[PDB]
Amino acid sequence: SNWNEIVDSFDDMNLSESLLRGIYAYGFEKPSAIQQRAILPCIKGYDVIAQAQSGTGKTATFAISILQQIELDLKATQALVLAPTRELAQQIQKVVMALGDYMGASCHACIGGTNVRAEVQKLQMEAPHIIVGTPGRVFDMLNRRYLSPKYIKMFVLDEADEMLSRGFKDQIYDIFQKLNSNTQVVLLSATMPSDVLEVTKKFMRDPIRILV
Amino acid sequence: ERYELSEKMLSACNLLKYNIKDPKALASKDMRICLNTLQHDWFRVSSQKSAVPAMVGDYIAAFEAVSPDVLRYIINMADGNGNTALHYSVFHSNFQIVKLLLDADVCNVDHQNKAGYTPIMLAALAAVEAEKDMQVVEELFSCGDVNAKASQAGQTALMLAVSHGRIDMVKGLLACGADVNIQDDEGSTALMCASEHGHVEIVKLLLAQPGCNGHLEDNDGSTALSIALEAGHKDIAVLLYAHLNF
Numbered sequence: 014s015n016w017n018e019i020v021d022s023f024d025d026m027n028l029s030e031s032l033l034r035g036i037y038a039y040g041f042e043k044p045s046a047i048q049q050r051a052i053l054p055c056i057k058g059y060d061v062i063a064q065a066q067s068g069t070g071k072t073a074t075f076a077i078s079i080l081q082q083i084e085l086d087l088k089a090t091q092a093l094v095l096a097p098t099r100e101l102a103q104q105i106q107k108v109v110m111a112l113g114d115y116m117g118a119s120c121h122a123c124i125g126g127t128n129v130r131a132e133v134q135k136l137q138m139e140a141p142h143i144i145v146g147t148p149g150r151v152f153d154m155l156n157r158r159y160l161s162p163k164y165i166k167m168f169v170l171d172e173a174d175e176m177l178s179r180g181f182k183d184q185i186y187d188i189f190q191k192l193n194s195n196t197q198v199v200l201l202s203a204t205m206p207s208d209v210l211e212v213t214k215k216f217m218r219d220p221i222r223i224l225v
Numbered sequence: 226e227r228y229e230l231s232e233k234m235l236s237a238c239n240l241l242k243y244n245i246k247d248p249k250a251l252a253s254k255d256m257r258i259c260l261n262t263l264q265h266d267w268f269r270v271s272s273q274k275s276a277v278p279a280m281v282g283d284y285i286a287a288f289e290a291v292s293p294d295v296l297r298y299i300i301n302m303a304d305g306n307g308n309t310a311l312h313y314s315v316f317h318s319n320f321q322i323v324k325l326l327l328d329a330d331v332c333n334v335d336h337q338n339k340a341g342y343t344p345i346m347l348a349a350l351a352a353v354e355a356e357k358d359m360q361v362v363e364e365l366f367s368c369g370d371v372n373a374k375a376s377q378a379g380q381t382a383l384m385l386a387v388s389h390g391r392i393d394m395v396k397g398l399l400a401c402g403a404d405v406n407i408q409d410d411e412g413s414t415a416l417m418c419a420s421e422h423g424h425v426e427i428v429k430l431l432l433a434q435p436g437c438n439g440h441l442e443d444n445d446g447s448t449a450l451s452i453a454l455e456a457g458h459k460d461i462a463v464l465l466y467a468h469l470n471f
Binding site: 088089129130131133134136137138139140157158161163 | 312340346350351
Protein backbone atom coordinates (compact mmCIF):
# COMPACT_ATOMS: atom_id res chain seq x y z
CA SER A 14 0.00 0.00 0.00
CA ASN A 15 2.27 2.77 -1.29
CA TRP A 16 -0.35 4.53 -3.41
CA ASN A 17 -2.92 7.05 -2.17
CA GLU A 18 -5.93 7.15 -4.49
CA ILE A 19 -8.72 4.61 -3.95
CA VAL A 20 -11.93 4.73 -6.00
CA ASP A 21 -15.09 2.99 -4.77
CA SER A 22 -16.92 3.08 -8.11
CA PHE A 23 -16.35 1.82 -11.65
CA ASP A 24 -18.07 4.99 -12.85
CA ASP A 25 -15.20 7.11 -11.54
CA MET A 26 -12.40 4.89 -12.87
CA ASN A 27 -12.36 6.83 -16.16
CA LEU A 28 -13.30 3.77 -18.21
CA SER A 29 -14.85 3.84 -21.68
CA GLU A 30 -18.63 3.38 -21.75
CA SER A 31 -18.27 0.10 -23.67
CA LEU A 32 -16.08 -1.43 -20.97
CA LEU A 33 -18.38 -0.10 -18.25
CA ARG A 34 -21.42 -1.62 -19.97
CA GLY A 35 -19.52 -4.90 -20.23
CA ILE A 36 -18.69 -4.76 -16.52
CA TYR A 37 -22.23 -4.09 -15.33
CA ALA A 38 -23.65 -6.63 -17.78
CA TYR A 39 -21.18 -9.25 -16.56
CA GLY A 40 -22.58 -9.05 -13.04
CA PHE A 41 -20.39 -6.63 -11.11
CA GLU A 42 -21.71 -3.78 -8.95
CA LYS A 43 -19.14 -2.11 -6.72
CA PRO A 44 -15.39 -2.86 -6.99
CA SER A 45 -13.63 -4.88 -4.29
CA ALA A 46 -10.76 -3.17 -2.45
CA ILE A 47 -8.05 -4.57 -4.74
CA GLN A 48 -9.70 -3.09 -7.84
CA GLN A 49 -10.38 0.20 -6.07
CA ARG A 50 -6.69 0.51 -5.20
CA ALA A 51 -4.95 -1.05 -8.21
CA ILE A 52 -7.01 -0.47 -11.37
CA LEU A 53 -6.23 3.22 -12.01
CA PRO A 54 -2.43 3.26 -11.63
CA CYS A 55 -2.30 0.09 -13.75
CA ILE A 56 -4.09 1.84 -16.62
CA LYS A 57 -1.66 4.71 -16.06
CA GLY A 58 1.12 2.28 -16.98
CA TYR A 59 2.94 1.89 -13.67
CA ASP A 60 4.61 -1.39 -12.74
CA VAL A 61 2.39 -3.07 -10.15
CA ILE A 62 2.83 -5.75 -7.48
CA ALA A 63 -0.37 -7.14 -5.97
CA GLN A 64 -0.47 -9.60 -3.07
CA ALA A 65 -3.99 -10.93 -2.52
CA GLN A 66 -5.60 -14.33 -1.97
CA SER A 67 -7.26 -16.35 -4.73
CA GLY A 68 -10.84 -15.12 -4.51
CA THR A 69 -10.46 -11.41 -3.76
CA GLY A 70 -11.31 -10.29 -7.29
CA LYS A 71 -7.79 -10.36 -8.72
CA THR A 72 -8.69 -11.31 -12.31
CA ALA A 73 -11.11 -8.45 -12.97
CA THR A 74 -8.45 -5.93 -11.94
CA PHE A 75 -5.89 -6.52 -14.69
CA ALA A 76 -8.72 -7.62 -16.99
CA ILE A 77 -10.25 -4.15 -16.73
CA SER A 78 -6.86 -2.41 -16.86
CA ILE A 79 -5.83 -4.30 -20.00
CA LEU A 80 -9.21 -3.94 -21.71
CA GLN A 81 -9.06 -0.19 -21.10
CA GLN A 82 -5.45 0.07 -22.29
CA ILE A 83 -6.06 -1.64 -25.65
CA GLU A 84 -5.97 0.37 -28.88
CA LEU A 85 -8.67 -1.53 -30.77
CA ASP A 86 -7.82 -0.20 -34.24
CA LEU A 87 -4.33 -1.62 -33.84
CA LYS A 88 -4.67 -5.18 -35.14
CA ALA A 89 -1.71 -6.55 -33.20
CA THR A 90 -0.94 -8.18 -29.85
CA GLN A 91 -0.72 -5.56 -27.12
CA ALA A 92 -1.11 -7.52 -23.88
CA LEU A 93 0.39 -10.79 -22.65
CA VAL A 94 -0.92 -12.66 -19.60
CA LEU A 95 0.66 -15.73 -18.00
CA ALA A 96 -1.05 -18.39 -15.89
CA PRO A 97 0.16 -21.54 -14.06
CA THR A 98 -2.41 -23.84 -15.71
CA ARG A 99 -4.55 -24.32 -18.82
CA GLU A 100 -7.80 -24.11 -16.87
CA LEU A 101 -6.84 -20.81 -15.27
CA ALA A 102 -5.78 -19.33 -18.61
CA GLN A 103 -9.09 -20.39 -20.16
CA GLN A 104 -10.92 -18.88 -17.18
CA ILE A 105 -9.06 -15.58 -17.54
CA GLN A 106 -9.80 -15.56 -21.27
CA LYS A 107 -13.49 -16.18 -20.60
CA VAL A 108 -13.57 -13.32 -18.09
CA VAL A 109 -11.73 -10.93 -20.42
CA MET A 110 -13.99 -11.79 -23.36
CA ALA A 111 -17.04 -11.41 -21.12
CA LEU A 112 -16.02 -7.96 -19.86
CA GLY A 113 -15.23 -6.96 -23.44
CA ASP A 114 -18.46 -8.22 -25.00
CA TYR A 115 -19.29 -4.62 -25.95
CA MET A 116 -15.79 -3.48 -26.91
CA GLY A 117 -14.52 -5.44 -29.91
CA ALA A 118 -11.19 -6.70 -28.59
CA SER A 119 -9.80 -10.18 -29.26
CA CYS A 120 -8.48 -12.60 -26.65
CA HIS A 121 -6.69 -15.87 -27.47
CA ALA A 122 -5.57 -18.62 -25.09
CA CYS A 123 -2.11 -20.18 -25.42
CA ILE A 124 -2.58 -23.64 -23.91
CA GLY A 125 -0.69 -26.87 -24.59
CA GLY A 126 -3.65 -29.08 -25.42
CA THR A 127 -4.09 -27.58 -28.87
CA ASN A 128 -2.70 -28.42 -32.30
CA VAL A 129 0.14 -25.98 -33.02
CA ARG A 130 -0.55 -25.73 -36.78
CA ALA A 131 -4.20 -24.67 -36.62
CA GLU A 132 -3.48 -22.21 -33.80
CA VAL A 133 -0.70 -20.65 -35.87
CA GLN A 134 -3.05 -20.35 -38.85
CA LYS A 135 -5.61 -18.63 -36.62
CA LEU A 136 -2.83 -16.24 -35.56
CA GLN A 137 -1.97 -15.70 -39.23
CA MET A 138 -5.56 -14.60 -39.79
CA GLU A 139 -5.59 -12.23 -36.82
CA ALA A 140 -3.02 -11.17 -34.22
CA PRO A 141 -5.12 -11.19 -31.01
CA HIS A 142 -5.20 -7.95 -28.99
CA ILE A 143 -4.76 -10.00 -25.83
CA ILE A 144 -2.89 -13.28 -25.40
CA VAL A 145 -3.27 -15.31 -22.20
CA GLY A 146 -1.72 -18.70 -21.52
CA THR A 147 0.92 -20.94 -19.97
CA PRO A 148 4.59 -19.79 -19.87
CA GLY A 149 5.90 -22.72 -21.91
CA ARG A 150 3.40 -22.40 -24.77
CA VAL A 151 3.59 -18.60 -24.79
CA PHE A 152 7.38 -18.71 -24.97
CA ASP A 153 7.04 -21.39 -27.65
CA MET A 154 5.01 -18.99 -29.78
CA LEU A 155 7.41 -16.11 -29.07
CA ASN A 156 10.48 -18.18 -29.95
CA ARG A 157 8.99 -19.51 -33.19
CA ARG A 158 8.32 -15.87 -34.14
CA TYR A 159 4.58 -16.57 -34.44
CA LEU A 160 3.80 -14.17 -31.60
CA SER A 161 5.31 -10.69 -31.91
CA PRO A 162 6.55 -8.60 -28.94
CA LYS A 163 6.64 -5.46 -31.09
CA TYR A 164 3.36 -3.99 -29.83
CA ILE A 165 3.20 -5.71 -26.44
CA LYS A 166 3.17 -3.03 -23.74
CA MET A 167 1.49 -5.07 -21.00
CA PHE A 168 2.95 -8.10 -19.22
CA VAL A 169 0.82 -9.73 -16.52
CA LEU A 170 1.99 -12.60 -14.30
CA ASP A 171 -1.05 -14.15 -12.62
CA GLU A 172 -0.16 -16.26 -9.56
CA ALA A 173 3.63 -16.04 -9.92
CA ASP A 174 4.26 -18.33 -6.95
CA GLU A 175 2.21 -21.03 -8.68
CA MET A 176 4.11 -20.72 -11.95
CA LEU A 177 7.42 -20.89 -10.09
CA SER A 178 6.22 -23.86 -8.02
CA ARG A 179 5.59 -25.72 -11.26
CA GLY A 180 9.00 -24.69 -12.58
CA PHE A 181 8.24 -22.00 -15.15
CA LYS A 182 11.11 -19.77 -13.98
CA ASP A 183 13.24 -20.32 -17.09
CA GLN A 184 10.24 -19.64 -19.33
CA ILE A 185 9.36 -16.41 -17.52
CA TYR A 186 12.93 -15.12 -17.77
CA ASP A 187 13.05 -16.12 -21.46
CA ILE A 188 9.84 -14.20 -22.11
CA PHE A 189 11.41 -11.23 -20.32
CA GLN A 190 14.25 -11.61 -22.82
CA LYS A 191 11.70 -11.63 -25.65
CA LEU A 192 9.64 -8.60 -24.61
CA ASN A 193 10.64 -4.95 -25.00
CA SER A 194 12.31 -3.11 -22.11
CA ASN A 195 9.58 -0.46 -21.99
CA THR A 196 6.93 -3.11 -21.33
CA GLN A 197 4.73 -2.40 -18.31
CA VAL A 198 4.87 -5.23 -15.76
CA VAL A 199 2.13 -6.38 -13.38
CA LEU A 200 2.55 -9.31 -11.00
CA LEU A 201 -0.06 -11.07 -8.87
CA SER A 202 0.92 -13.57 -6.17
CA ALA A 203 -0.61 -14.77 -2.90
CA THR A 204 2.77 -15.65 -1.39
CA MET A 205 6.07 -13.82 -1.88
CA PRO A 206 8.96 -16.32 -1.90
CA SER A 207 12.55 -15.43 -2.81
CA ASP A 208 12.12 -16.11 -6.54
CA VAL A 209 9.07 -13.86 -6.96
CA LEU A 210 10.77 -11.02 -5.10
CA GLU A 211 13.86 -11.61 -7.23
CA VAL A 212 11.89 -11.31 -10.48
CA THR A 213 10.12 -8.16 -9.27
CA LYS A 214 13.46 -6.66 -8.21
CA LYS A 215 15.12 -7.55 -11.51
CA PHE A 216 12.56 -6.44 -14.09
CA MET A 217 10.20 -3.94 -12.42
CA ARG A 218 10.91 -0.25 -11.84
CA ASP A 219 9.33 1.87 -9.09
CA PRO A 220 6.34 -0.46 -8.68
CA ILE A 221 3.06 0.16 -6.86
CA ARG A 222 2.92 -2.44 -4.08
CA ILE A 223 -0.47 -3.43 -2.68
CA LEU A 224 -1.33 -5.89 0.10
CA VAL A 225 -4.82 -7.23 0.84
CA GLU B 226 -30.84 -23.16 -61.42
CA ARG B 227 -28.58 -20.18 -60.78
CA TYR B 228 -28.37 -18.34 -57.47
CA GLU B 229 -29.61 -14.76 -57.74
CA LEU B 230 -28.45 -11.66 -55.87
CA SER B 231 -30.83 -10.15 -53.33
CA GLU B 232 -32.49 -6.87 -54.30
CA LYS B 233 -30.47 -4.83 -51.80
CA MET B 234 -27.26 -6.48 -52.99
CA LEU B 235 -28.06 -5.87 -56.67
CA SER B 236 -29.04 -2.25 -56.02
CA ALA B 237 -25.94 -1.80 -53.86
CA CYS B 238 -23.96 -3.02 -56.85
CA ASN B 239 -25.84 -0.55 -59.05
CA LEU B 240 -24.94 2.36 -56.76
CA LEU B 241 -21.35 1.10 -56.72
CA LYS B 242 -21.27 1.13 -60.53
CA TYR B 243 -22.85 4.59 -60.43
CA ASN B 244 -20.14 6.04 -58.19
CA ILE B 245 -17.11 3.75 -58.61
CA LYS B 246 -15.34 6.49 -60.58
CA ASP B 247 -16.34 9.15 -58.05
CA PRO B 248 -14.01 9.38 -55.01
CA LYS B 249 -15.90 12.13 -53.17
CA ALA B 250 -19.21 10.32 -53.64
CA LEU B 251 -17.63 7.03 -52.53
CA ALA B 252 -16.35 8.63 -49.33
CA SER B 253 -19.71 10.18 -48.40
CA LYS B 254 -21.55 8.85 -45.34
CA ASP B 255 -24.61 7.26 -46.98
CA MET B 256 -22.53 5.66 -49.74
CA ARG B 257 -20.25 4.22 -47.05
CA ILE B 258 -23.35 2.79 -45.37
CA CYS B 259 -24.24 1.20 -48.71
CA LEU B 260 -20.71 -0.17 -49.22
CA ASN B 261 -20.81 -1.56 -45.68
CA THR B 262 -24.05 -3.41 -46.35
CA LEU B 263 -22.56 -4.73 -49.60
CA GLN B 264 -19.30 -5.82 -47.96
CA HIS B 265 -21.07 -7.58 -45.10
CA ASP B 266 -23.20 -9.37 -47.68
CA TRP B 267 -20.17 -10.39 -49.78
CA PHE B 268 -18.24 -11.74 -46.79
CA ARG B 269 -21.38 -13.47 -45.53
CA VAL B 270 -21.67 -15.25 -48.88
CA SER B 271 -18.02 -15.99 -49.69
CA SER B 272 -15.98 -16.12 -46.49
CA GLN B 273 -17.89 -18.21 -43.94
CA LYS B 274 -17.04 -21.89 -43.38
CA SER B 275 -20.43 -22.99 -44.69
CA ALA B 276 -20.07 -20.96 -47.90
CA VAL B 277 -21.28 -22.55 -51.15
CA PRO B 278 -19.13 -22.64 -54.33
CA ALA B 279 -22.02 -22.48 -56.84
CA MET B 280 -23.51 -19.49 -55.01
CA VAL B 281 -20.17 -17.65 -55.02
CA GLY B 282 -19.66 -18.40 -58.72
CA ASP B 283 -23.14 -17.20 -59.64
CA TYR B 284 -22.57 -14.08 -57.54
CA ILE B 285 -19.28 -13.41 -59.33
CA ALA B 286 -21.03 -13.85 -62.68
CA ALA B 287 -23.70 -11.38 -61.57
CA PHE B 288 -21.08 -8.92 -60.31
CA GLU B 289 -19.41 -8.98 -63.71
CA ALA B 290 -22.86 -8.72 -65.29
CA VAL B 291 -23.33 -5.41 -63.49
CA SER B 292 -19.77 -4.28 -64.24
CA PRO B 293 -16.25 -5.79 -64.32
CA ASP B 294 -15.15 -2.83 -62.19
CA VAL B 295 -17.81 -3.79 -59.65
CA LEU B 296 -16.57 -7.39 -59.67
CA ARG B 297 -12.96 -6.31 -59.14
CA TYR B 298 -14.02 -3.88 -56.41
CA ILE B 299 -16.09 -6.41 -54.47
CA ILE B 300 -13.74 -9.39 -54.85
CA ASN B 301 -10.84 -7.45 -53.34
CA MET B 302 -12.78 -6.08 -50.37
CA ALA B 303 -11.06 -6.56 -47.01
CA ASP B 304 -12.48 -6.54 -43.49
CA GLY B 305 -11.16 -4.81 -40.37
CA ASN B 306 -8.33 -7.32 -40.12
CA GLY B 307 -7.23 -6.81 -43.72
CA ASN B 308 -8.59 -10.22 -44.66
CA THR B 309 -10.17 -10.73 -48.08
CA ALA B 310 -12.39 -13.51 -49.41
CA LEU B 311 -9.28 -15.32 -50.67
CA HIS B 312 -7.82 -15.30 -47.15
CA TYR B 313 -10.93 -16.86 -45.60
CA SER B 314 -11.35 -19.27 -48.50
CA VAL B 315 -7.84 -20.59 -47.97
CA PHE B 316 -8.18 -20.55 -44.17
CA HIS B 317 -11.44 -22.53 -44.26
CA SER B 318 -10.01 -24.95 -46.85
CA ASN B 319 -12.86 -24.03 -49.20
CA PHE B 320 -10.60 -24.53 -52.20
CA GLN B 321 -13.44 -24.71 -54.71
CA ILE B 322 -14.16 -21.10 -53.75
CA VAL B 323 -10.42 -20.36 -53.91
CA LYS B 324 -10.45 -21.73 -57.45
CA LEU B 325 -13.50 -19.62 -58.32
CA LEU B 326 -11.75 -16.49 -57.03
CA LEU B 327 -8.61 -17.32 -59.02
CA ASP B 328 -10.59 -17.97 -62.21
CA ALA B 329 -12.10 -14.49 -61.87
CA ASP B 330 -8.65 -13.17 -62.85
CA VAL B 331 -9.25 -9.90 -60.99
CA CYS B 332 -8.31 -11.20 -57.56
CA ASN B 333 -5.36 -9.57 -55.79
CA VAL B 334 -3.61 -12.80 -54.86
CA ASP B 335 -0.74 -11.12 -53.01
CA HIS B 336 -2.73 -8.98 -50.56
CA GLN B 337 -1.28 -9.02 -47.04
CA ASN B 338 -3.73 -8.82 -44.16
CA LYS B 339 -2.99 -6.65 -41.12
CA ALA B 340 -1.36 -9.66 -39.45
CA GLY B 341 1.08 -9.51 -42.36
CA TYR B 342 0.34 -12.77 -44.16
CA THR B 343 -0.73 -13.54 -47.74
CA PRO B 344 -3.22 -16.18 -48.92
CA ILE B 345 -0.23 -18.28 -50.04
CA MET B 346 1.35 -18.13 -46.58
CA LEU B 347 -2.00 -19.20 -45.15
CA ALA B 348 -2.11 -22.03 -47.70
CA ALA B 349 1.32 -23.22 -46.58
CA LEU B 350 -0.26 -24.09 -43.22
CA ALA B 351 -3.72 -25.05 -44.49
CA ALA B 352 -5.36 -28.46 -44.17
CA VAL B 353 -5.41 -30.17 -47.57
CA GLU B 354 -7.61 -33.28 -47.67
CA ALA B 355 -7.80 -34.50 -51.28
CA GLU B 356 -5.61 -34.12 -54.37
CA LYS B 357 -8.07 -31.64 -55.91
CA ASP B 358 -7.50 -29.29 -53.00
CA MET B 359 -3.72 -29.57 -53.41
CA GLN B 360 -4.13 -28.84 -57.12
CA VAL B 361 -5.98 -25.64 -56.23
CA VAL B 362 -3.24 -24.86 -53.70
CA GLU B 363 -0.51 -25.26 -56.31
CA GLU B 364 -2.45 -23.10 -58.76
CA LEU B 365 -2.58 -20.46 -56.02
CA PHE B 366 1.18 -20.84 -55.47
CA SER B 367 1.86 -20.39 -59.17
CA CYS B 368 -0.56 -17.46 -59.55
CA GLY B 369 0.76 -15.23 -56.77
CA ASP B 370 4.10 -14.22 -55.28
CA VAL B 371 5.32 -17.51 -53.79
CA ASN B 372 8.47 -15.75 -52.56
CA ALA B 373 6.72 -12.99 -50.60
CA LYS B 374 7.78 -12.36 -47.00
CA ALA B 375 5.50 -11.92 -43.98
CA SER B 376 5.54 -8.50 -42.33
CA GLN B 377 6.27 -9.80 -38.83
CA ALA B 378 9.39 -11.96 -39.11
CA GLY B 379 10.04 -11.87 -42.86
CA GLN B 380 8.88 -15.47 -43.21
CA THR B 381 8.13 -16.93 -46.64
CA ALA B 382 5.58 -19.66 -47.33
CA LEU B 383 8.43 -22.14 -47.76
CA MET B 384 9.90 -21.24 -44.36
CA LEU B 385 6.50 -21.63 -42.69
CA ALA B 386 5.91 -25.00 -44.35
CA VAL B 387 9.39 -26.19 -43.37
CA SER B 388 9.04 -24.96 -39.77
CA HIS B 389 6.04 -27.25 -39.26
CA GLY B 390 7.64 -30.15 -41.14
CA ARG B 391 5.06 -30.25 -43.93
CA ILE B 392 6.90 -32.39 -46.50
CA ASP B 393 4.19 -32.48 -49.19
CA MET B 394 3.61 -28.74 -48.85
CA VAL B 395 7.35 -28.12 -49.26
CA LYS B 396 7.26 -30.33 -52.36
CA GLY B 397 4.36 -28.29 -53.71
CA LEU B 398 6.05 -24.96 -53.01
CA LEU B 399 9.26 -26.14 -54.68
CA ALA B 400 7.27 -27.38 -57.68
CA CYS B 401 5.74 -23.91 -57.97
CA GLY B 402 9.04 -22.03 -58.00
CA ALA B 403 9.64 -21.14 -54.36
CA ASP B 404 13.13 -19.70 -53.84
CA VAL B 405 15.17 -21.75 -51.37
CA ASN B 406 17.92 -19.19 -50.74
CA ILE B 407 15.68 -16.39 -49.43
CA GLN B 408 16.48 -15.23 -45.88
CA ASP B 409 14.17 -13.91 -43.16
CA ASP B 410 14.63 -11.06 -40.66
CA GLU B 411 17.14 -13.14 -38.70
CA GLY B 412 18.96 -14.19 -41.87
CA SER B 413 17.62 -17.73 -41.59
CA THR B 414 16.87 -19.92 -44.60
CA ALA B 415 14.52 -22.86 -45.05
CA LEU B 416 17.63 -25.07 -45.00
CA MET B 417 18.71 -23.69 -41.62
CA CYS B 418 15.20 -24.14 -40.23
CA ALA B 419 14.99 -27.74 -41.46
CA SER B 420 18.45 -28.44 -40.05
CA GLU B 421 17.55 -27.00 -36.65
CA HIS B 422 14.19 -28.77 -36.39
CA GLY B 423 15.81 -31.94 -37.70
CA HIS B 424 13.69 -32.59 -40.79
CA VAL B 425 15.93 -34.96 -42.76
CA GLU B 426 13.60 -35.47 -45.74
CA ILE B 427 13.01 -31.73 -46.06
CA VAL B 428 16.77 -31.10 -45.90
CA LYS B 429 17.17 -33.63 -48.72
CA LEU B 430 14.41 -31.88 -50.68
CA LEU B 431 16.03 -28.46 -50.32
CA LEU B 432 19.56 -29.67 -51.10
CA ALA B 433 18.26 -31.39 -54.24
CA GLN B 434 17.10 -28.04 -55.64
CA PRO B 435 19.45 -26.56 -58.28
CA GLY B 436 21.39 -23.63 -56.82
CA CYS B 437 20.65 -24.30 -53.16
CA ASN B 438 23.18 -22.16 -51.29
CA GLY B 439 24.38 -23.81 -48.10
CA HIS B 440 27.04 -21.14 -47.55
CA LEU B 441 24.48 -18.57 -46.37
CA GLU B 442 24.75 -17.41 -42.76
CA ASP B 443 22.18 -16.01 -40.35
CA ASN B 444 22.77 -12.82 -38.35
CA ASP B 445 24.73 -14.83 -35.78
CA GLY B 446 27.07 -16.10 -38.49
CA SER B 447 25.62 -19.61 -38.33
CA THR B 448 25.29 -21.84 -41.38
CA ALA B 449 22.90 -24.77 -41.75
CA LEU B 450 25.89 -27.04 -41.10
CA SER B 451 26.90 -25.36 -37.84
CA ILE B 452 23.25 -25.28 -36.78
CA ALA B 453 22.84 -29.00 -37.50
CA LEU B 454 26.04 -29.81 -35.61
CA GLU B 455 25.05 -27.59 -32.69
CA ALA B 456 21.60 -29.19 -32.51
CA GLY B 457 23.07 -32.70 -32.50
CA HIS B 458 21.65 -33.72 -35.87
CA LYS B 459 24.70 -35.56 -37.18
CA ASP B 460 23.10 -37.23 -40.21
CA ILE B 461 21.85 -33.87 -41.50
CA ALA B 462 25.28 -32.44 -40.69
CA VAL B 463 26.90 -35.12 -42.87
CA LEU B 464 24.41 -34.39 -45.66
CA LEU B 465 25.19 -30.68 -45.52
CA TYR B 466 28.94 -31.23 -45.27
CA ALA B 467 28.93 -33.58 -48.26
CA HIS B 468 26.88 -30.96 -50.11
CA LEU B 469 29.17 -28.03 -49.31
CA ASN B 470 32.59 -29.60 -49.72
CA PHE B 471 32.48 -31.87 -52.77
